[PDB]
Structure 1
């Protein structure tokens, strides 16, 4: 039987092999499974049940070792170095929160979520108790809803007749355990106080109506510590807002309902028309809250100085961008951004670079990529939400060269897992829906609690190990 020379190596701190064990002969036809079983065995790592993947020259093994050597035109006596890593636990389907209309946005309140941590300050916001996590959904019907994890609605925002949104909501987030922000087609951002009584009953009351945008407000990011909000609008502008009455300035009267050309109505701290096409995303720098990044259908990622409104830097990518997310990396002040495009791929960028590559592409979605959420567990993975009806999980540790079909420039990373729309998967059909028909994903968030995704099938879907 044919053999292959293998050297094992790893970056997992707890899983180092003793030196005499690292170099080994294995059957040439062994695959990931067999290699994984070897590491778990008693004579090796003795971990028993840990699924491993293997990096060879920077990309995951997905074949037998014999085939890897064949496909790369290597000698039979080639020694392969296999960097083993812990693989992602599959996030399988758990539950659906049924809605009457399309779900445009989802967010999660847990002790470890951003709003939970901002609440842990305990500075007028109560800490999130374990077991009492909350899920926020926003709908095209114009209403916000708060769910417990078991899937009961605890609270629903008031209608347009009672101080609520007067048109479809496009975006929403928790600032803290008792404060939320939302935005949509009525050109407003609303700030809400949330109170809960007997754990199954709650109330959302508007505290601010924020005016400034002259088109749909399609995306929002929040900072619950400083009580600030960033918006991106179809008007091509980036908005910067205080979420507190003590700091929100007076509004442009010409934008108010009833204007001829009771919640407090206020304007922005800043409103900057920096994009020549719809602005689609705006986020705080995770490490420096005076810095923001925006993305737009005009193909650019811009870096903003929030103290001045100045565009500090402009990257021009090759396609319209529909989404932006920051990855936080140990040892580095500058994030790595994921930018989801209208051309179905995701581009990874360092916002402090020249436009011309100064490059990694995430390929696999069959439609627009409109939502992104970094893994809460580490710094090399994230989940994307797409109008193709899927959410895809990516591992950036794995990158292969691009093929000519992919422009032959840069590295390409493929998904490690695909989360199907359960409403379609439970049909037991092989034909996926074309053009996201009835199943577009509009929003995904990845919490320790799980991966939550909402869209056109009118459900928040819950996936987790």
Structure 2
């Protein structure tokens, strides 16, 4: 009793040219056997790689002919088997304790965007494997630069000293030299960051940017072309320069009129109200740097040309959108939209039907971030106090409410604490996925680190 099988794959660097051809023993045959077959000298000659397998968009957890047995399928027929690199489970490692809620988390690494930006053309240092930094924004009104080992190198200036005058909603590394943040003071602040031989840093605010009337809830950066874009509760998306060199003069009716020291106050080089409701998310396009994507509570994802003020496309979903992230995958991306309805809608902005829905979060999905390695995968994080890891190659036809649906591959809880009702104490505000990996800040006043 043997069964013939055909391997297929979406993995770029792993393929068998003619060798998709094999006949196999389906006796106590599972993920394990097949995986050690793919790793064999005869096939991929990798030899160590954990694999998983998808038949028609579904993981095989059972014996292969128990599979064809249950479905009533005949023995002799061939089963085409997709194989994917199995995700190494991100168990718990470290925690960085803050005084208040952690609103934002970002990572400076060699493979992180700011690292790749700072490496090229320099005017900054390519970060060494030894030195990684983790930025954390807090409701304190304090930015903090953290060691990879989880110590505080530097904290942003107080209060009156030029720091934020309110809570900080979002922050990012635009480059190893310069970092940007935004908050409830309606300002977008740009910081210069230098570090001493002994480990202590300094964050000196370079720029105070007032374009917004409202809270700035979202911030995205481009370190190459030196640009920031922001999503605010006014329903507007700001587009900013981080350089004092080219910046417009501020409105001056948005200005405070404390006062220890004066840093240059400037305005946005663009500002656009495209939204009926508060704008939840704004991101650059992964490839074309002049294209941006907005998400809002008005159910819309808008493709927005940064060259003009134009909005070149609008896409309307069934619920308000609390977050947005772009995955590469084709010269246009595939968007992921975090919802108030607890789902994640996968959206193609290109010329509306939804590709698939990521289901199983118990609350609002406030943050997303794509995998650094295999990019059919992505991590989400949500107000239910959890961060969930998805594989888009996993898909099932919808049942009661419609299509196609993906359930989570892995679930990351808060080790601080059954899982508390609503978001009580545990809410996850921000998640970033690096190859250090899966840093998640939130309401429990800490940044959690998960990696394998």
TM category (shorter chain) comes to over 0.9
8 Å CA contact 1:180, 1:193 repeated in 2: yes
Compare 64-73 and 220-229 and name the one that shifted more.
Answer: 64-73
| Larger relative helix fraction | 1
**CA-to-aligned-CA distance 1:46-83 (integer Å, 9 cap, x gap):** 65532111121133223333453355442344432222
Contact 2:162 2:260 in 1 (8 A): no
C-alpha deviations, 1:364-397, integer Å up to 9, x for none?
2111111111111133111111111111111122
- Change in CA separation of 1:201 and 1:413 when aligned onto 2, cut-off 3 Å: same
Deviations 1:204-248 (A, max 9, x none): 001111111111100000111121110001110000111110111
Assess, with a 3 A threshold, how the Cα gap between structure 1 residues 46 and 267 changes in structure 2: closer, same or farther.
closer
Distance 1:230 1:106 in 2: 17
Pair 72,317 (structure 1): closer, same or farther in 2 beyond 3 Å: farther
**Structure 2 residue 354 is matched with structure 1 residue 358:** yes
> Is the CA contact (8 Å cut-off) linking 2:182 and 2:217 kept in structure 1?
yes
- Please state how far the C-alpha of 1:163 moved relative to its aligned partner: 0.7
Question: Where does the alignment leave 5 or more consecutive residues of structure 1 unmatched?
Answer: 425-430
Relative to 1, partners in 2 of residues 1:201 and 1:274: Cα closer, same or farther, differing over 3 Å? same
Instruction: Determine if contact 2:105/2:171 at 8 Å carries over to the other structure.
Output: yes
Shift in Å, 1:25 = 3.9
- The residue aligned with 2:74 is 75
Q: What is the CA distance between 1:34 and its match in structure 2?
A: 3.9
Q: Structure 1 residues 17, 182: CA separation in 2 closer, same or farther (over 3 Å shift)?
A: closer
- 2:299–2:320 contact (8 Å) kept in structure 1: yes
8 Å Cα contact 2:301/2:315 also seen in 1:
yes
TM-score, normalising length: structure 1: 0.91
**1:458 corresponds to 2:451:** no
Deviation at 1:4, TM superposition (A): 4.5
SS at match of 1:302: strand
Residue 19 to residue 127, structure 1, CA distance change in 2 (3 Å):
closer
CA contact 2:26–2:63 (8 Å) conserved in 1: no
Shift of 1:291: 0.9
Cα distance in 2 for partners of 1:337, 1:264 equals 36
Distance 1:293 1:8, change over 3 A: closer
Which segment is superposed worse, 46-55 or 360-369? 46-55
User: Cα–Cα, structure 1 residues 65 and 173, in superposed 2: closer, same or farther, change >3 Å?
Assistant: same
CA separation of 1:397/1:81 partners in 2, compared to 1, >3 Å: closer, same or farther? same
Call closer, same or farther: CA 1:110–1:3 in 2, change over 3 Å: same
Contact 1:125 1:177 (C-alpha < 8 Å) held by counterparts = yes
| 1:433-465, Cα deviation, whole Å (9 max, x unpaired) | 221211111111111222111111111111111
Contact 1:41 1:48 survives alignment (8 Å): yes
SS at match of 2:66: helix
Other-structure match for 2:140 = 141
Q: Secondary structure at the match of 1:150?
A: coil
Q: Is the 8 A contact 1:9 1:22 kept in 2?
A: no
Task: Give the SS at the match of 1:193.
Answer: strand
Alignment check: 8 A CA contact 2:239 2:271 kept:
yes
Residue 21 to residue 113, structure 1, CA distance change in 2 (3 Å)? closer
Q: Report Cα offsets for 1:100-127 as digits up to 9, x if no partner.
A: 1110000011111111111112442222
1:131 is aligned to 130
1:405 matches 2:392: no
* Contact map agreement 1:104 1:169 (CA 8 A) in 2: yes
Note the C-alpha offset of 1:45: 5.6
Output the CA distance in 1 between the equivalents of 2:219 and 2:389: 23
Q: Helix, strand or coil: the match of 1:66?
A: helix
Alignment of 1:45-56 (within 5 A): 47-56=46-55
Q: Structure 1 residues 34, 433: closer, same or farther in 2, change over 3 A?
A: farther
Instruction: Give the SS at the match of 2:127.
Output: coil
Superposed CA deviations along residues 176-230 of structure 1, whole A, max 9, x for unmatched, are 1110110011111100000101251000001111111111100000111121110
Determine if contact 1:4/1:76 at 8 Å carries over to the other structure. yes
SS in structure 2 at match of 1:83: strand
TM-score (norm 2): 0.93
1:137, 1:146 within 8 Å by CA — same for their partners in 2?
A: yes
Relative to 1, partners in 2 of residues 1:242 and 1:10: Cα closer, same or farther, differing over 3 Å? closer
Contact 2:2 2:23 in 1 (8 A): no
Are 1:142 and 1:168, in contact at CA under 8 Å, matched by a contact in 2? yes
Displacement of 1:44 after TM fit?
6.4
Could you tell me how far 1:8 is from its partner in structure 2?
3.6
State the shift of 1:14 in Å: 6.7
**C-alpha distance in 2 between matches for 1:288 and 1:351:** 14
Change (3 A) 1:264 1:343: same
- Say how many residue pairs are matched: 451
User: What is the rounded CA distance, in whole Å, between the counterparts of 1:397 and 1:285 in structure 2?
Assistant: 23
Structure 1 residue 94: Cα displacement: 1.3
